[PDB]
């Protein structure tokens with residue numbers, strides 16, 4: 163799979179049509195489109211099965227380059243859950259003058275900047291997907 | 296939140312909300328600023344305002360302490376405490392405060408919105424902290440007054456040096472000078488992008504820029520100002536008489552290139568901060584340049600109040616100082632880019648106050664001290680920290696842009712902190728060998744203002760003629776039209792076309808605006824032209840008002856020419872004072 | 882009454898001054914933490930290549 167590819171929305175629908183063609187309930191590959199919490203659970207159950215196919219590198223925070231004071235930043239403007247599908251932030255500022263406290267806290271808590279500013283990590287002690295050092 | 300006071304430098308948490316700068320005030324100081332002014336809003340970690348829902352009072356003496364919040368009389372709880380008590384507003388450090396009997400100066404600085412010269416007089420005749428607060432208040436009100444001007448919405452782009460520009464109705468016309476450069480930022484499809492900084496001046500506005508650009512639809516230029524940060528560093532540390540020449544490294548080899556400046560350098564090496572009173576062109580541009588070569592052992596830092604005035608500094612600096620070892624830091628408007636960027640550790644540093652990082656040096660030279668204000672001096676001293684400060688010039692130059700000044704122009708000795716000691720206690724140093732201007736101009740300025748300290752260079756050719764015209768005064772927008780002067784221009788140019796090889800000097804470009812219909816030459820302002828001049832000069836005063844063309848305007852504007860200058864003395868001030876030639880129409 | 886209402890007002894003023902000191906210290910801590918976080922973000926962005 164393409165390393166940059168994270169959506170897989172079409173692939174999830176193709177998997178559902180291939181293995182659950184006559185499952186008579188609407189399946190939302192992205193749980194943002196679900197009707198209620200019961201539908202969220204229903205579609206997340208299928209997303210659990212369908213995410214075992216897609217690469218583990220395509221999940222986690224969905225990051226893009228934004229500019230603050232004209233200086234580029236790498237922040238997570240979305241997330242690709244193995245269960246909730248692709249979720250995109252709604253209040254995403256690709257450009258900004260300055261961040262006072264709230265956006266500063268969000269970007270500090272954001273693993274995007276730390277992972278992008280860290281060294282690639284291959285930790286063979288654990289089978290868990292390492293991100294960065 | 297918490298900081299030192301302006302009158303006492305004592306820690307306090309009270310800030311005047313009705314002050315444009317909101318300085319920190321001691322409890323006694325806050326009380327004094329509250330009782331004697333209409334400043335009824337005082338700020339703290341929380342604003343001193345009635346927090347009761349449905350109330351809008353914003354006083355302080357009417358505000359009472361109720362519970363954990365603030366209330367007025369109409370909403371205070373039964374347990375209430377007056378904010379104004381014991382001659383001090385309730386705030387942090389209510390027991391550790393000294394106050395000051397000098398409270399009228401602070402009130403005059405704050406209450407008066409910089410309308411007359413007395414505000415500047417009292418701002419300059421006080422302590423450092425009060426002067427800095429006055430300077431930042433003046434900058435804030437200058438920004439407010441500048442934002443109340445017209446907005447240039449470009450409807451069409453016609454050609455170069457001229458635009459099909461229109462604006463709104465009612466909004467006034469920007470002034471003539473370059474002090475109102477436009478730095479607006481337009482939007483094209485999604486957000487703001489880079490535009491650039493240019494100094495639009497009146498010659499449908501001529502731009503004095505060396506680069507080219509094509510405007511688009513919806514692009515507008517605004518008088519963009521900056522946020523005035525608080526000023527910490529003083530203008531200058533007090534002087535002290537040194538016993539020996541210290542602070543600068545004495546080298547065993549001395550420079551014999553400027554024999555008449557060795558004594559000046561020796562005297563500078565004895566004083567902490569010094570300033571030499573010399574007319575424009577009296578080694579003003581190269582005094583620091585020759586100092587950097589006489590003693591190549593001091594960190595020489597050059598700075599100017601204008602970004603467009605650095606070309607005169609760099610014209611001969613590259614010939615005198617080395618080019619390889621000198622460099623200019625390029626921030627991330629037209630200057631050299633062949634230098635090496637990010638040269639933090641360098642003996643010679645060229646930069647501007649807008650983007651000057653923290654650094655240290657030994658000798659700092661500030662050319663063009665007339666147009667720099669106390670805020671500019673504080674910025675210069677805060678960006679660059681050194682034990683010596685050198686000021687080149689004199690108060691008898693073109694004054695600073697006192698745009699909000701409505702009454703009579705400020706006296707030269709009140710322009711800056713340097714001008715205060717330059718004219719009251721006496722000039723620390725003076726130049727007695729001024730071999731730059733001939734006998735006419737040097738003798739005139741010596742007999743006029745310069746304490747007969749200048750001597751004749753060479754003989755006066757007495758080739759200058761003055762005609763006796765009268766003219767009529769009529770204002771249309773900001774200038775006047777004089778057909779008799781149009782007549783005398785031709786009556787002077789009739790003799791030879793070789794007279795024209797000159798630079799047209801005029802504070803107001805109305806003559807160029809009138810002539811543009813037939814000639815159309817690009818317009819440039821004389822604000823930043825020192826150090827570069829031609830032999831012949833074309834001078835048309837066209838004015839007689841003391842508001843701008845006052846007594847201290849022409850005595851240094853006639854010093855630019857070498858031997859040829861128009862000396863049309865249409866004003867009845869020095870006509871019957873000198874001996875030139877004059878004739879009537881045959 | 883002068884030793885019960887005035888003494889209560891003095892205690893209330895001391896409590897208010899203490900709360901103001903705590904709020905000022907909180908704002909100073911906010912400024913320090915803001916500067917630290919901003920510098921951390923700016924010094925980790927420069928290593929992004």
Ligand SMILES: [Zn+2]
Nearest residue numbers: 311313314334
């Ligand atoms: Zn005030």
Ligand SMILES: [Zn+2]
Nearest residue numbers: 300303321324
């Ligand atoms: Zn005080």
Ligand SMILES: [Zn+2]
Nearest residue numbers: 345350367370
């Ligand atoms: Zn109230």
